[model samples]
Target: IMKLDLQNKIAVVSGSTSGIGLGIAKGLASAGATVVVVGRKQAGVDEAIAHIRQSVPEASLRGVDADLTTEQGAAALFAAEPKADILVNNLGIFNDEDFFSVPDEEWMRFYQVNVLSGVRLARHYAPSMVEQGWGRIIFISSESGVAIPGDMINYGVTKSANLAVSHGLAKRLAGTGVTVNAVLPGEVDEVANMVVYIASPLSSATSGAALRVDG
Candidate 1:
């Protein structure tokens, strides 16, 4: 059996207070990583930490309250945690709005939350990962990146941007032992499992690939 150990590692997962983010946080904690659970409020962060500890009692978890949709929010997270060994660019927001009716401002809002949040966090943590010579960078993208959804055009656009960024960063970080990848889910129950694997050293051979967990 292969070991999926993440001992002595620090993993930063954005939007980890609920849904897939929470599941991924639990999975990583199960694998022995010091999981940083991020959310917009301290209460949510605390809730997520308590939830993860329910299953992984020995899990090392830290709570960070930050709204990663803005530059200042990202800065706050940086101030709280100076370095991370794993970065999961998973903070995103979505809604079902008609394509033509989506005003420029709403589209910009979608971009700010879905895409830019990941960009800022990755920019901060990825260089440290490179210098350390071992790290994991994962973009929790959606299948909408490839199969555009008419009702949620703005959200789809952001997912595609996620795919593009992950591919480009992987190429840029080539040979550095720091791998970058995107996880495309429909979005799913199996997502946490795949993300947990990708977050581990076991996935060292995989990079720049968009792994799917459609369900």
Candidate 2:
């Protein structure tokens, strides 16, 4: 097993109350980073912290209850935790709908929730990462982004946008000792594995790339 020590680093994960996001939060915390878990509801945030503590009794964990899909929520998070060494854009929504049947509002909502949520958080923390000269920004994209699902075209589109944004931001931050990348995980464990490595100093040479975890 690869051992990654992230002591003294602060990690912020959006939508980390459950599922893959929760798993990632636990993974980072297990690696010794102080993890801030963000979710839409306070109950979810509280439960996630409890669950993480169950597995990692010594984990340093914090909870932020906010809807990351909106600018106001992102602002609230920024105000609460102004700086972080790692940011994971793990918040997203997905649904199956016929291409032509998807309403404009639905499309807009998905874009705002899945694509722009990460954009807002990254925008806020990126400059600070550059200034610190060391940081990690990871987006939880999907294989569906590359192999678009016909039934979930709208969802696929937002994930594709995630890849684009991650790559663009990686290039934009080149030579600054900050890394931006996207991971396509087929399972929650896969997502956590890649995230922990990327958030650690071990992934210093990997950036501006989309990694696939098919298992």
Candidate 3:
């Protein structure tokens, strides 16, 4: 049996207003971590907070409305909540636009939203985790990163960067009691289950491991 207690821990999930991010937030809340439900809009953040409390009546939750696609937004988050015990880098642009049709602007957006945002958060949070002696960083990457779907190679590029960041960060934190892993969840919700497990302390054995999930 695995232990899932995260009581008194602080969890920060980017883009947690809907889909996989939201589900991960709910699952984390259920597991007793004080979850920071992050979103770009205050309305959406409020809505997600309300939604989670409906299912997890006793959940400890806080909401932060900051557009994570830019450096300023990441700074806003850090200013609001300075540290965290669990950081789930689950935000990304899943646009499957044709490879040739995308503009440089679009690729930049994909890179910022999918890759840099998580890296920025990890940069700010991982040091504190190391100092604290225990932390979990889960990067929700995608299989397309490796397979490189021709139709969505633009997005795949960012996902592969996520895997690279996850692996390198894990190795960087080696022997620090902190763990980093990538979970390439398929287009689905049961991914919340996969994320919940990784976000918990029981997942300490796996570091820099990429786990694939299919819908």
User: Please, what is the whole-model Cα lDDT of each candidate in the order they appear?
Assistant: 0.89, 0.91, 0.88
lDDT of 3 at 10: 95
Candidate that scores best on lDDT: 2
Q: Which clashing pairs does model 2 show?
A: none
Q: Kindly report which residue stretches of model 3 are placed more than 4 angstroms away from their true locations once superposed.
A: 1-3, 187-189
Order by lDDT, highest first: 2, 1, 3
Name the lDDT value of residue 117 in candidate 3.
Answer: 93
Instruction: Give the clashing residue pairs of candidate 1, or none.
Output: none
Which candidate wins on TM-score?
2
lDDT of 1: 0.89
Better of 2 and 3 by lDDT: 2
Q: Candidate 2 residues 5-94, lDDT tens each?
A: 566899999989999899999999999999999998999999999999999999999888898899999999999999999999999988
